[PDB]
Amino acid sequence: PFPTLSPATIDAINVIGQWLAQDDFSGEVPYQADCVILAGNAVMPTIDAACKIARDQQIPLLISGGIGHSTTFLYSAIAQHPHYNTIRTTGRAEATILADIAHQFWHIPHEKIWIEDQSTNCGENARFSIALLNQAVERVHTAIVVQDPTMQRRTMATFRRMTGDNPDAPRWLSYPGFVPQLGNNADSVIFINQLQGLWPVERYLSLLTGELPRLRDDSDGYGPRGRDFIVHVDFPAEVIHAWQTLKHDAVLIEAMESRSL
């Protein structure tokens, strides 16, 4: 089992988790939109959040994802799901599989599901979703973007690199579905969110820690001073402290490097 961690380290992980999940830019604008965009991922609570909104608001659901890094995770996440195991996986694009959940299980009509099944990474999820939105029949002014909580911040900064946005009137709203939180229990670390289908802690920590150098606006990052894939990200001082706390935690490094991430 994944080892127990110091309270300081738990706190730090939770600070960075919160920041990656919670979009500051759009603050707390109500989630009333013209379309919901589900970026390809494997986190079933997130995927269900997208379907639930499109269902409840009776708006179009645009599902974006072809084949890339998260595809085989999605395949596994379907196969272990107590209801969605009936959906065929191997060899299909992400968005095709996710449309089966939307239609077969959430009863969203075909005419309300738009499938973008060719993107191979975050930049293409966003670029290709924008391309499809720009072809719109009924013009889209506001869209809710639903992504794995660890990659939410990157994804919103990718969309915003492409179109810009207005802080007084955000066109891109952010709803990963939940704010991931860890805690110690019985000689191990567990999620405190009472949700099925979450990453193994080791995988969540690999993702969470993989995002930070991408977000960091230096020559090695995805920002304007690096690859120029995303807008400049300003790191809060609390997040920097949290990231240093992780980098200095020997128990944590040992756990993360001796295991499957």
Side-chain angles (χ1 to χ4, degrees):
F2 195 96
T4 84
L5 300 172
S6 79
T9 293
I10 288 304
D11 292 345
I13 289 166
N14 289 340
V15 168
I16 293 158
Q18 183 167 205
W19 185 66
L20 291 177
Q22 281 184 164
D23 188 41
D24 6 273
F25 189 102
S26 60
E28 66 196 69
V29 170
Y31 289 105
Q32 294 161 214
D34 303 319
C35 167
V36 167
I37 300 174
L38 170 59
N41 78 97
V43 182
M44 290 293 161
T46 291
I47 290 164
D48 284 349
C51 295
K52 181 86 175 57
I53 292 174
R55 183 194 73 180
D56 292 348
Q57 277 190 48
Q58 313 165 100
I59 54 177
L61 170 61
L62 181 179
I63 307 179
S64 181
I67 299 278
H69 288 140
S70 55
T71 300
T72 63
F73 294 91
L74 175 56
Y75 298 171
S76 289
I78 294 278
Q80 72 165 27
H81 191 275
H83 304 291
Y84 306 153
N85 66 251
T86 57
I87 297 176
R88 295 172 287 109
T89 53
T90 304
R92 306 168 82 215
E94 292 168 1
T96 310
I97 290 166
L98 292 178
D100 283 342
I101 292 164
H103 178 74
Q104 296 174 352
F105 291 86
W106 287 84
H107 302 309
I108 297 163
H110 281 311
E111 67 205 303
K112 288 246 103 101
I113 299 165
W114 305 341
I115 292 170
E116 189 286 284
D117 61 358
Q118 294 296 323
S119 54
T120 66
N121 59 46
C122 185
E124 290 189 353
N125 292 341
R127 172 66 182 102
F128 290 11
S129 298
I130 288 160
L132 174 55
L133 287 174
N134 205 48
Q135 281 185 154
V137 277
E138 235 323 78
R139 218 80 207 120
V140 171
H141 289 101
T142 64
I144 295 153
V145 176
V146 178
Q147 170 71 278
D148 175 322
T150 57
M151 290 176 281
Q152 189 78 31
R153 182 169 290 271
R154 185 153 58 90
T155 293
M156 306 301 294
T158 305
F159 273 100
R160 293 190 180 125
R161 175 63 188 80
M162 285 173 199
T163 64
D165 209 346
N166 179 348
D168 290 323
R171 71 215 280 163
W172 304 113
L173 307 177
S174 176
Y175 196 91
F178 66 108
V179 173
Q181 179 190 333
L182 304 182
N184 287 311
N185 194 250
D187 309 317
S188 195
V189 184
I190 62 178
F191 281 97
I192 299 317
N193 311 84
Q194 301 298 309
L195 306 167
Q196 192 144 194
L198 299 184
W199 337 250
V201 171
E202 326 73 52
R203 175 67 182 166
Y204 169 68
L205 291 180
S206 175
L207 282 171
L208 172 147
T209 64
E211 287 303 291
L212 299 174
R214 297 177 164 166
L215 287 164
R216 178 171 54 180
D217 195 11
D218 68 14
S219 95
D220 293 311
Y222 283 17
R225 304 200 69 186
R227 301 177 82 159
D228 199 33
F229 295 159
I230 72 175
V231 297
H232 172 79
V233 173
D234 285 300
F235 279 63
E238 22 281 302
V239 177
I240 296 301
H241 176 72
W243 188 6
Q244 290 295 333
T245 292
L246 304 189
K247 288 180 70 165
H248 292 92
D249 183 335
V251 169
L252 184 61
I253 303 318
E254 176 86 79
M256 295 191 62
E257 291 188 1
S258 65
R259 287 130 167 288
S260 341
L261 300 197

